[PDB]
């Protein structure tokens, strides 16, 4: 599958199976050296960000190519597959190892192999089922937010509620405002004061409980494996349902099936299929990462605790009150009943192959498959609900279609010209096609739950244009790959290929890529035998690779319609253009070494690598005088230097007692080398990062200095002057900070002990050098603006003349985005803890139906050592806003074998 | 294997072959203009004037502008494929207007010289579409000059900028990255674009939905006024001021029905096309409106100081239409000029608070003639047209003497982004920290001090350039010190 000289990490069944999250790349965080996965949303429906050996580019995606059994499929389609059907994941991290893939093999390739049936005699059926709950994994953010009358006090004394007002005068007003607002809705007018207290200065409303819940994860699975002769079958049906812990509704449930089949027909032909499909329902909390008054983790920190979204029995009301409001405000469950949403995905995955063997040595393999996704989605705005703007209802139905076919057939000749010269030649063809399409229609004006067909809407000023979007791409490629092996100690691999992408114009869509590599078996040639060294191999590779992950239509210089009236068509210029836009051309030098110690009970593999991206696809920002936002261009350059090492070994004391550990590490230094427009630096506006030629993608802010004890004013260091401070902030006080945005250290470790059926596994993961701006704290910590929102208990201490010994400033001045928000988002995470117990062997003899059973208790994400003050340190890149934190899971599970 | 893929709903850019291709592109220009010369876009400079205080409801949207939070106004705004808002937005929409008016003006001039048209009737209309494109360029460059070039009255500035205009680009060139043109360049491009267009456009306006000679006369008079050229503004004033009559209202309800009707306002010289299903937008920043069934409720984020309310006589029809005593149900006034045009309501019965983009109305021309006439010693026609404008509004003015001009203008142009410019030329400091708030609104509209004072000539009466344009173009000289 991959080269003897390429950097290759392979992950096992166990790291992939039985995971209470549908994003299996999370299950790899800290398992492959140099592979940096990070899931920035606990939203069930979110997908991780894998990056092998750094960020490959400043504009094209750096996501690895994903391959399942030969066919490139999106993380979205992998999510609908049953990962209990996965035999192994293999990560390919250098140009030698990724030489027969296209589209974007410059980012490494993740190859997922589904299980085939073991050529057994009885053939094994196996049954799994598990239940568990999701929670939030950090509570510390609200340990020090002001309490109810603590915040009332702060405001009144701050003059926010007017000058010369007492605390009771103010609460007289807020309770006044809830009484007259609620008094206008038949559904509330004589429930306020009986069952509803939206305003309550004697109890602090638990705003965490308002917007977050404990939620369940449920999954089950049966799978018949076996076969016997030249034929093999692996079939499975399965179920999965993960509900999202945000009370803002979000979920991922899938109903799964798969059938894998291979059969030798005769001494020349072997055919086989792997078939997979699923009915899937996903929904996502779409308000997260924005700042909306009473939602998300921002809500749970900023809502004044004298505001009660609950009723009198502790249950969640339909609606809460905020002073000034003209409408009562729907709570998260009642918003959901009033804004219903569903979506069915029918997912099809058909893949065949033929393996003709005409004469000794050559293997012709032809493979093809489709990857169809028809998705049907419905959305309403329920009529007659009195907390809406109108009593009239709306409904929006959309239908989606993704069909991606790909054929990829090969001819391979292996021969030998001696006992010491092994040769392998293989070349192949591959056509990749994608056809996508999105259609949607909507109506409004409904006045009945039961009369809400789209075709029954009002017609006049209530009619709408449909929604319509199409997108297709295509790839044509020819590749070759050779293998020379002398005396079984020296091995060389060479490769040439040409890729052609629909995403570039006719005169620039082709590009040639090559690779050379050698593995040298130092052990078996220069050291026949050693009393402690078991295996020693030296690998080394150079090669070039293509990267094409960009839009589908990003070169043409185009017009779109922009109608001015209703009787004539109008036309505006749509896109800037780049007739010369073409492949990004990446380059990899990789020097590796693998070593085996003792009696292959101790392995190591170190790899040094130099990743070069020339012709880099940058979506260059354009000055606004141009009247555009962007235009992709092959502009600029970048470097990724680093090392990754991984090692593992076994520690018995009793043989019937296994202790086994594993470690995983990468360091990676990044260097932008060439930008655009002769620029040496480009700071990316209102992002706090900067591209500057000398250094890597870095943060860029003013150094906050603290406060002037004389005035209470905030001070920032003035860069370059002597250290010089100032009370006058200006944008020209900003400077590049020696902290990187892509976190430079990726690693993990995992332990294991097994006594006799009882075993404990723990997997850890870390990401050090991470930094993030805590956009949340821009709100919770200032005393110059947003005086409605709950604040941090540190503002009760703010400098005034009589309290002149603090580092928290006087009230009335807003904070700038300086280093006071740059938090150290490094974290170690305990990715999963599993205690499992496989029932004894002698418990089953005598009942010839069951052959074994296993029970396990399990936790995901329980330990999070980190300095970050905002729930999840993983939930972000450069900034961290209203986050949906990753979840903490407790799961108990069962397995049956017949 | 043909692996060209071409995007659906897109066509390739080509030069104009037919007259029908030209007309279709002129519309896209006018569509663009409609989300550009848009009242949403001028609220930022409306709120930065001395007229407003923030309420407890605001979520720091209008505060940077009302309380002069210079740390926020520096980078203020956005301009990507998610949101076009704020200062960055105001900048970006006018540049696209200019760039796209570039490729229209230049491609019509090319087609004419390549004689592609099928008769002289097309040729004559396309030479006239050409003048329209010219006015749009002058507006685009002037609106960019209104906000990113300094007045002659400013004191401290970054070294070099006191004489700079905006980046003048007369060609459709997306890749262009040049330096700032001078003041006299930008204003000579604006005035000559307009002069070259006023020659060609016909005396009588053909459509209130497109550029006309009457419009360019007015827009030019607006520009002269803000240039201090008082005599020259009064001459373009007189060319159109008598062709558009004032709203004939007996009470404030006949006034509100007429003024709020895009279709029936006899004062509208040039507006953007609007239907309920195309070209209507909600502009509920000033007023805080939201529908409630058959009604309208308000939760504003900023409200006038008392002195604004006290500007209006009680019998002024604008005092229940331009501003409206509907804050806290009936306790204080808000700016309600952009409340709704009912004609854009999906259902007659139910408000959706949608309006259209108006571009010039004869009320402004009355106030440009009146101010200019006072400066050039022409009292007879200075008082004729100011008493005319205020008597139509139900509160005819006592004495006519410039002091009187400032109030009446402030009243009529409220909400339209006009007051901040008026205080620069009238040499008024901000004085926001000392204005009384509306008493009826105590506890909802409180006083908030300036985060930075704004005395006469403060550099921040002019916006800084967007940080996108500064970071991508080291040859751009900044407005603010240091």
């Amino acid at each position: 599958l991959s080269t003897v000289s390429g950097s290759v990490a392979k992950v096992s069944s166990e790291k992939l199976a039985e995971k209470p999250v549908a994003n299996i790349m999370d299950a790899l965080q800290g398992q492959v050296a140099g592979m940096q996965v990070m899931t920035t949303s606990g939203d069930p429906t979110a997908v991780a960000s894998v990056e092998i050996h750094g960020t490959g580019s400043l504009g094209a995606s750096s996501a690895p190519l994903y391959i399942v059994d030969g066919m490139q499929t999106s993380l979205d389609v992998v999510a609908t597959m049953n990962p209990n059907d996965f035999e192994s994941m293999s990560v390919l991290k250098d140009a030698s190892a990724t030489s027969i893939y296209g589209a974007r093999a410059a980012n490494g390739v993740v190859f997922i192999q589904t299980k085939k049936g073991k050529m057994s005699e009885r053939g094994r059926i196996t049954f799994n089922a598990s239940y568990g709950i999701s929670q939030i994994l950090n509570t510390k953010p609200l340990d020090n937010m002001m309490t109810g009358d603590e915040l009332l006090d702060f405001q009144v004394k701050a003059g926010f509620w007017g000058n010369n007002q007492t605390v009771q005068k103010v609460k007289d007003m807020i309770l006044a405002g809830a009484e007259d607002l609620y008094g206008n809705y038949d559904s509330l007018k004589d429930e306020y004061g009986k069952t509803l207290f939206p305003v309550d200065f004697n109890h602090d409303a638990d705003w965490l409980k308002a917007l977050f819940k404990t939620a369940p994860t449920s999954q089950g699975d049966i799978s018949f494996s076996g076969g016997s002769q030249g034929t093999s079958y692996y079939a499975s049906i399965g179920y999965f349902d993960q509900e999202g812990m945000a009370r803002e509704p979000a979920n991922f449930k899938r109903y799964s099936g798969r059938l894998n089949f291979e059969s030798r027909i005769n001494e020349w032909l072997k055919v086989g299929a792997n078939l997979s499909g699923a009915i899937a329902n996903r929904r996502s909390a779409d308000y997260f990462g924005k700042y909306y008054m009473g939602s998300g983790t921002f809500g749970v920190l900023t809502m004044p605790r004298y505001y009660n979204p609950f009723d009198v029995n502790g249950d969640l009301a339909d609606v809460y009150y905020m002073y000034g409001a003209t409408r009562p405000s729907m709570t998260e469950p009642y918003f959901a009943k009033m804004r219903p949403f569903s979506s069915e995905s029918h997912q099809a995955n058909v893949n065949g192959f033929a393996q003709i063997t005409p004469i000794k040595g050559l293997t012709l393999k032809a493979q093809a498959g489709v990857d169809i996704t028809n998705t049907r989605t419905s959305s309403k705005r329920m009529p007659n609900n009195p907390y809406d703007s109108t009593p009239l209802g709306e409904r929006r139905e959309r239908a989606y279609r993704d069909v991606s076919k790909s054929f990829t057939n090969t001819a391979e000749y292996k021969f030998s010209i001696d006992e010491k010269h092994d040769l392998t030649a293989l070349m192949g063809h591959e056509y990749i096609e994608y056809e996508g399409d999105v259609i949607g229609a909507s109506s409004k004006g409904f006045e009945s739950d039961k009369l809400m067909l789209l075709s029954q809407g009002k017609t006049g000023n209530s009619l709408s244009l449909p929604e319509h979007r199409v997108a297709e791409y295509a790839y044509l490629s020819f590749f070759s790959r050779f293998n020379y092996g002398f005396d079984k100690w020296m091995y060389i691999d060479f490769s040439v290929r040409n890729d052609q992408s629909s995403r570039f114009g006719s005169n620039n869509r082709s590009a040639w890529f090559y690779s050379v590599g050698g593995m040298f078996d130092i052990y078996n040639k220069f050291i026949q035998e050693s009393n402690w060294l078991s295996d020693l191999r030296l690998k080394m590779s150079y090669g070039t690779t293509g990267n094409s992950e960009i839009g589908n239509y990003n070169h043409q210089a185009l017009v779109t319609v922009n109608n001015y009236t209703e009787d004539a068509m109008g036309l505006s210029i749509s896109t800037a253009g780049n007739p010369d836009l073409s492949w990004e051309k990446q380059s990899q030098f990789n020097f590796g070494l693998a070593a085996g110690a003792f009696n292959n009970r101790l392995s190591a593999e170190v790899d040094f690598y130099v990743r070069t991206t020339n012709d880099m696809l940058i979506d260059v920002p354009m000055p606004y005088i141009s009247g555009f936002f962007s235009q992709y261009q092959n502009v600029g350059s970048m470097k990724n230097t680093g090392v990754d090492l991984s090692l593992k070994g076994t520690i018995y004391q009793n043989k019937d007692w296994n202790v086994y550990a594993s470690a995983n590490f990468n360091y990676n230094r990044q260097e932008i080398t060439k930008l655009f427009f002769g620029l040496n630096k480009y700071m990316l506006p209102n992002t706090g990062t900067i591209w500057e030629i000398g250094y890597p993608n870095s943060f860029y802010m003013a150094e906050y200095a603290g406060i002037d004890k004389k005035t209470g004013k905030q001070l920032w260091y003035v860069p370059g002057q002597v250290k010089v401070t100032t009370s006058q902030y200006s944008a020209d006080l900003e400077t590049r900070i020696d902290k990187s945005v892509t976190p430079p250290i990726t690693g993990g470790f995992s332990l294991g002990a097994s006594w006799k059926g009882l075993s404990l596994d723990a997997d850890f993961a870390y990401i050090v050098g991470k930094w993030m701006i805590n956009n949340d704290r821009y709100f919770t910590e200032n005393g110059g603006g947003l005086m409605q929102l709950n604040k941090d208990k540190m503002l009760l201490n703010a400098w005034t003349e009589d309290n002149k010994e603090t580092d928290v400033p006087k009230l009335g001045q807003s904070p700038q985005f300086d280093t006071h928000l740059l938090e150290n988002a490094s974290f170690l995470r305990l990715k999963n803890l599993k205690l499992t117990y496989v029932l004894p062997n002698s418990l089953f003899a005598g009942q010839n139906v069951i052959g074994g059973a296993r029970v396990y208790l399990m936790a995901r994400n329980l330990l999070t050592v980190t300095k970050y003050k905002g729930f999840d340190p993983e939930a972000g890149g450069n900034v961290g806003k209203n986050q949906y934190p990753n979840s903490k899971q407790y799961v108990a599970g069962i397995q049956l074998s017949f | 294997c043909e692996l060209d893929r071409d995007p659906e709903g897109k066509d390739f850019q080509q030069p104009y072959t037919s007259f029908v291709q030209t007309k279709q592109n002129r519309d896209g220009l006018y569509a663009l203009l409609r989300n550009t010369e848009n009242p949403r876009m001028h609220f930022y400079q409306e709120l930065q004037s001395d007229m407003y205080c923030t309420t407890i409801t605001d979520g720091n949207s209008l505060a940077p502008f009302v309380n002069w939070d210079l740390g926020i106004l520096n980078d203020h705004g956005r301009a990507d494929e998610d949101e076009v808002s704020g200062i960055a937005g105001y900048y970006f929409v006018y540049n696209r207007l200019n760039q796209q008016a570039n490729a229209f003006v230049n491609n019509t001039e090319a087609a004419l010289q390549n004689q592609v048209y099928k008769n002289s009737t097309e040729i004559a209309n396309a030479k006239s579409f050409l003048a329209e494109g010219k006015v749009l360029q002058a507006l685009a460059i002037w609106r960019l000059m209104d906000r990113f070039s300094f007045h002659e009255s400013v004191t401290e500035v970054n070294s070099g900028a006191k004489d700079l205009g905006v980046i003048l680009l007369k060609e459709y060139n997306p890749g262009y990255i040049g330096p700032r043109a001078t003041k006299a360049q930008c204003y000579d491009y604006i005035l000559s674009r307009l002069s070259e267009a006023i020659e060609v456009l016909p005396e009588n306006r053909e459509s209130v939905l497109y550029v006309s000679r009457d419009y360019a006369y007015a827009l030019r008079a607006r520009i002269y006024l803000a240039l201090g050229e008082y005599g020259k503004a009064a001459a373009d004033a007189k060319m159109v001021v008598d062709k558009y009559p004032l709203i004939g209202a007996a009470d404030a309800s006949e006034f509100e029905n007429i003024y709020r009707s895009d279709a029936n306002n006899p004062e509208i010289i040039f507006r953007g096309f609007a239907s309920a299903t195309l070209g209507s937008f909600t502009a509920t920043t000033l007023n805080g409106a939201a529908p409630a069934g058959k009604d309208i409720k308000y939760n504003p984020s900023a409200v006038p100081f008392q002195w604004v309310v006290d500007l209006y006589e009680n019998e002024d029809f604008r005092k229940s239409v331009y501003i409206a005593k509907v804050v806290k149900k009936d306790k204080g006034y808000l700016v309600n000029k952009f409340l709704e045009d009912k004609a854009y309501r999906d259902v007659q019965d139910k408000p959706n608070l949608k309006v259209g983009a108006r571009y010039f109305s004869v009320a402004e021309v009355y106030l440009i003639l009146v101010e200019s006439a006072l400066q050039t010693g022409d009292t007879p026609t200075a008082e004729k047209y100011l008493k005319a404008l205020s008597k139509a509004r139900g509160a005819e003015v006592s004495v006519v003497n410039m002091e009187a001009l400032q109030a009446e203008r402030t009243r009529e142009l409220i909400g339209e982004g006009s007051r901040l410019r008026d205080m620069v030329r009238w040499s008024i400091p901000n004085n926001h920290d000392a204005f009384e708030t509306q008493p009826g609104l105590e506890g909802f509209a409180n006083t908030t001090p300036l985060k930075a004072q704004a005395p006469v000539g403060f550099y921040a009466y002019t916006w800084e350039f967007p940080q996108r344009d500064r970071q991508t173009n080291p040859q751009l000289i900044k407005n603010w010190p240091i």
């Binding site: 909306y292 706090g688 956009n775 709100f779 | 979520g59």
Partner: peptide, 10 residues
């Protein structure tokens, strides 16, 4: 009801 305050974008 959103609080723009400041949205340092990602």
């Amino acid at each position: 009801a959103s609080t723009t305050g400041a949205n340092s974008q990602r």
